[PDB]
Structure formats: structure tokens, C-alpha cells
Design a protein around this motif. Structure first.
Motif, short mmCIF file in Angstrom:
data_model
loop_
_atom_site.label_atom_id
_atom_site.label_comp_id
_atom_site.label_asym_id
_atom_site.label_seq_id
_atom_site.Cartn_x
_atom_site.Cartn_y
_atom_site.Cartn_z
N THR A 10 0.58 -1.35 0.13
CA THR A 10 0.31 0.02 -0.05
C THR A 10 0.62 0.96 0.14
O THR A 10 0.42 2.59 -0.75
CB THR A 10 -1.27 0.32 1.03
OG1 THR A 10 -1.55 -1.11 1.06
CG2 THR A 10 -1.94 1.14 1.21
N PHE A 11 1.72 1.19 1.14
CA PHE A 11 2.71 2.84 0.89
C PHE A 11 3.60 2.82 -0.26
O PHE A 11 3.28 4.11 -0.99
CB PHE A 11 3.69 2.40 2.14
CG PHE A 11 3.24 2.85 3.62
CD1 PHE A 11 3.52 4.25 3.77
CD2 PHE A 11 2.81 2.11 4.62
CE1 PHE A 11 3.65 4.83 4.47
CE2 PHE A 11 1.79 2.72 5.68
CZ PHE A 11 2.07 3.88 5.83
N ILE A 12 4.05 1.38 -1.02
CA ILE A 12 4.65 1.66 -2.03
C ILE A 12 4.28 2.10 -3.11
O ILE A 12 4.78 2.95 -3.67
CB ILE A 12 5.14 0.81 -2.24
CG1 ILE A 12 6.72 0.59 -1.43
CG2 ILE A 12 5.87 0.43 -4.51
CD1 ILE A 12 7.67 -1.38 -1.44
N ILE A 51 -5.60 3.16 -1.25
CA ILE A 51 -4.81 3.70 -2.51
C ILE A 51 -5.73 4.74 -2.95
O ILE A 51 -5.35 5.83 -3.06
CB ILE A 51 -4.18 2.20 -3.72
CG1 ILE A 51 -3.82 1.44 -2.01
CG2 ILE A 51 -3.70 2.85 -3.94
CD1 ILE A 51 -2.36 0.51 -3.09
N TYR A 52 -6.25 4.27 -3.19
CA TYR A 52 -7.76 4.97 -4.26
C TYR A 52 -8.43 6.56 -3.59
O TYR A 52 -7.94 7.51 -4.27
CB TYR A 52 -9.23 4.48 -4.90
CG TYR A 52 -8.90 3.43 -5.81
CD1 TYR A 52 -8.87 2.54 -6.19
CD2 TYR A 52 -8.83 4.20 -7.33
CE1 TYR A 52 -8.42 1.58 -7.00
CE2 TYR A 52 -9.06 3.34 -8.76
CZ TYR A 52 -8.96 2.10 -8.40
OH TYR A 52 -8.65 1.03 -8.76
N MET A 53 -8.28 6.09 -2.56
CA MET A 53 -8.82 7.49 -1.19
C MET A 53 -7.25 8.52 -0.97
O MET A 53 -7.82 9.70 -1.23
CB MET A 53 -9.44 6.54 -0.26
CG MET A 53 -10.55 7.53 0.76
SD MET A 53 -12.28 6.87 -0.80
CE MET A 53 -12.44 5.24 0.24
N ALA A 54 -6.29 7.64 -0.61
CA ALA A 54 -5.44 8.46 -1.29
C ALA A 54 -4.89 9.01 -2.11
O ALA A 54 -4.42 10.72 -1.79
CB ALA A 54 -3.90 7.56 -0.26
N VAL A 55 -5.09 8.49 -3.09
CA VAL A 55 -4.54 9.72 -4.42
C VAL A 55 -5.32 10.28 -4.67
O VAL A 55 -4.79 11.26 -4.95
CB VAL A 55 -4.52 8.33 -5.57
CG1 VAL A 55 -4.24 8.73 -6.96
CG2 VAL A 55 -3.20 7.33 -4.74
N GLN A 56 -6.82 10.15 -4.17
CA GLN A 56 -7.66 11.43 -4.42
C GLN A 56 -7.83 12.23 -3.64
O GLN A 56 -7.99 13.68 -4.08
CB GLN A 56 -9.24 10.84 -4.29
CG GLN A 56 -9.96 10.55 -3.37
CD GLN A 56 -10.48 9.40 -3.77
OE1 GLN A 56 -10.90 8.40 -4.09
NE2 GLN A 56 -12.27 9.69 -3.30
#
Lengths: 83, 270
Positions: B213-215, B259-264
Motif C-alpha cells: 500500500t505504501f509503495i 490507495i484510491y482514497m489517498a490518491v484522490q
């Protein structure tokens, strides 16, 4: 190459006419991120953390199948039982 | 959505060998017997103890983005017998930043074995010498500035910044990704400021779940940073690409959605 069955056992330990207490063994030193429990009439699905070795299924008037993730290096098909 | 299940089914058979990790002489170097590094991306260790039959192995993989500064090392949490190997790897790759994704113990289970000395203390791991000169604390993480060098070789000392994430809940993922994003921004500021810095090591426990997830979040955030909103953010493709170098990166559906939430969240912040 080696291949292991995860889990190795699947047992119905306790039951009410609408609930079912299912249990399975856990392979030591084997990583399991989560389990997927599918149940149906001889379907419905839910997931459960890899820490657990027991589960409860409610809302029943039955085939139960346990998948372990990740999926590689496994016997080729999941464990299942009828009740 | 349902794409994560498609990727999980895609990883039901691995397309690259993991033979070096399956050797008898390495059986005590893996936390789990089903989490093994790929042979063609594993980190090969030099200068081992010749008394051991195999001293070039560590459950670690080099992870490169593809459609050292921009690469990573994804490895498991240290075992009591692999701490010296971990420090040999950190020295050999000229790594300057470490990201711990779990606490030492969480819910009674030991996830990451302590491999660093306390503040103002100094310890030797094999031929490596590690000094903890300063520890700082933020809300989401703890920063430790370490000095790594080879014993009898004072001209090899370099600073390694260890960012230990501590807010990750015992179950599930963080409900808000702001902490992870600020943490990764600090890590990126640190890594970018060091010239000829090696891969950023990301590790704890199994080293595929939270590590993946982090990478993946870091890779996508760097893409957005480099080209803006006019770019393609393909989460399943990035997960497939990182999985071709380490098996099973990103493991749960919650992390997939995180991942989606962090990117958005990062996109809306720009």
C-alpha cells in the motif's frame, strides 16, 4: 516445489437452527491475509481476518467453503463441508 | 471494487521462481514459508560470515517503477537472526530512508523485531555500527536519525532516517489518508535531498500488505507530482507491475480502496 492445504480442517462445532459456529485449523508459519467464507444451499459470501480461526453464520432456514488468501502454493481447491 | 478479486485470482500461480528462498539453508530466514522473494529481483547480500553455508539471502526485493532514488526495497520484518543481514542490506544498497509500517508488537503479536539502539546509544550488528543521535516524535510517526558505518572503516558513515509509522489501526486501514500522505511527503523531502541515495526500504511483518500500500501510493503520488492531474492513474496496473517483483503486494480490499482514497485526497489537495 511444495504445496500446502490451507486450511486443513473445517468443523461445525456448535449450532442453533438459524446460526452455525464454524471453525478451521491454521497452518503454522503460513501467511493468510484473510479468509473468504462462502455459504449456500446444497451463494452468500463474507470475509474474515487471518488472525481468526472461528466464525459465525446467521440467517439460515448447506455447503460452506473456506478460501485463504494469498492463493498461490495451495492444493488446488478450497476446503468445504455440508451441514 | 471487484477488480481486487481479479488480481488476487491472477496471483493464484506465480510466474517467476522463488528457489533461493526455498533452500534448506534459508529456511530460518523467512517469517512465513509462503512469502518468499522472487529470484530475479531479490537482494543479494555480500560480505557474509563464511561460517554460514549461505550468507547472501534476505527476504527482500528491489521494487522499481516501470510503465535507486526512485526505487524501493520491500522486505519482511526482522527476525532475531536476520538483523545483521538487514543492516548489511541497508549498507550495501546505500539506503538512507527506512519506513516501518507496524509497531514492534500489535495485539500481542510481534510484527517487527527491534533492530536499532535507543536514543544517544550505539550498537554493533555484525560488522555494522549504528548510532541513534536523535529521536523526534510527530502525531503519526516517530523519526530516528541513525548513523550507519562499517567497523574499522570510519570513512563509510552515512545517515539513515527511520520513519516509524505508528497510527495504523490494529484492524483495517486508516479512516482518513491525510496522515499517510503527510508522512510520505516528509519521506519524499528527505529522500530527494540526499544525492546518490539508495532505495527507500519499506518493511515490517510480512512486507507485502501495508508495505505494498505504501509503495504503490508513493509511486502514484510521485506520478501526480511530476505531471499533474493530466496523467493516467492505473491502480490495478501499478499493483500488477509491483507484483512482478514481489508477490502479493497489497493484500486486503481495504488497502486497495485506501490507495484510491489517498490518491484522490492528494489530487484534491493540489
Amino acid at each position: 516445489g511444495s504445496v500446502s492445504s490451507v486450511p486443513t480442517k473445517l468443523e461445525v462445532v456448535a449450532a442453533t437452527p438459524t446460526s452455525l459456529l464454524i471453525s478451521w485449523d491454521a497452518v503454522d508459519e503460513w501467511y493468510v491475509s484473510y479468509y473468504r467464507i462462502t455459504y449456500g444451499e446444497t451463494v452468500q459470501e463474507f470475509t474474515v481476518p487471518g488472525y481468526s480461526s472461528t466464525a459465525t453464520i446467521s440467517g439460515l432456514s448447506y455447503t460452506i467453503t473456506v478460501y485463504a488468501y494469498p492463493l498461490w502454493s495451495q492444493g488446488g481447491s478450497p476446503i468445504s463441508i455440508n451441514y | 471494487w471487484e477488480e481486487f478479486e481479479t488480481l488476487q485470482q491472477q496471483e493464484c500461480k506465480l510466474l517467476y521462481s522463488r528457489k533461493e528462498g526455498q533452500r534448506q539453508e534459508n529456511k530460518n530466514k523467512n517469517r512465513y514459508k509462503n512469502i518468499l522473494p522472487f529470484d530475479h529481483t531479490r537482494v543479494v547480500l555480500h560480505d557474509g560470515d563464511p561460517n554460514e553455508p549461505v550468507s547472501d539471502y534476505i527476504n527482500a526485493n528491489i521494487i522499481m517503477p516501470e510503465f535507486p532514488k526512485k526505487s524501493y526495497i520491500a522486505t519482511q520484518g526482522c527476525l532475531q537472526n536476520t538483523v545483521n543481514d538487514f543492516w548489511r542490506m541497508v549498507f550495501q544498497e546505500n539506503s538512507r530512508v527506512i519506513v516501518m509500517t507496524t509497531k514492534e508488537v500489535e495485539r500481542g503479536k510481534s510484527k517487527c523485531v527491534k533492530y536499532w539502539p535507543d536514543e544517544y546509544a550505539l550498537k554493533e550488528y555484525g560488522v555494522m555500527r549504528v548510532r541513534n543521535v536523535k529521536e523526534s516524535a510527530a502525531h503519526d510517526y516517530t523519526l530516528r536519525e541513525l548513523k550507519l558505518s562499517k567497523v574499522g572503516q570510519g570513512n563509510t558513515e552515512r545517515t539513515v532516517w527511520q520513519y516509524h509509522f505508528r497510527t495504523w489501526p490494529d484492524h483495517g486501514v486508516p479512516s482518513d489518508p491525510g496522515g499517510v500522505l503527510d508522512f510520505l511527503e516528509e519521506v519524499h523531502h528527505k529522500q530527494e535531498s540526499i544525492m546518490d541515495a539508495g532505495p527507500v526500504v519499506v518493511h515490517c511483518s510480512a512486507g507485502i500488505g501495508r508495505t505494498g500500500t505504501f509503495i504503490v501510493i508513493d509511486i502514484l503520488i510521485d506520478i501526480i507530482r511530476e505531471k499533474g492531474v493530466d496523467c493516467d492513474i492505473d491502480v490495478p496496473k501499478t499493483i500488477q507491475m509491483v507484483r512482478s517483483q514481489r508477490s502479493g503486494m497489497v493484500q486486503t480490499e481495504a488497502q486497495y480502496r485506501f490507495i484510491y482514497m489517498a490518491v484522490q485526497h492528494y489530487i484534491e489537495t493540489l
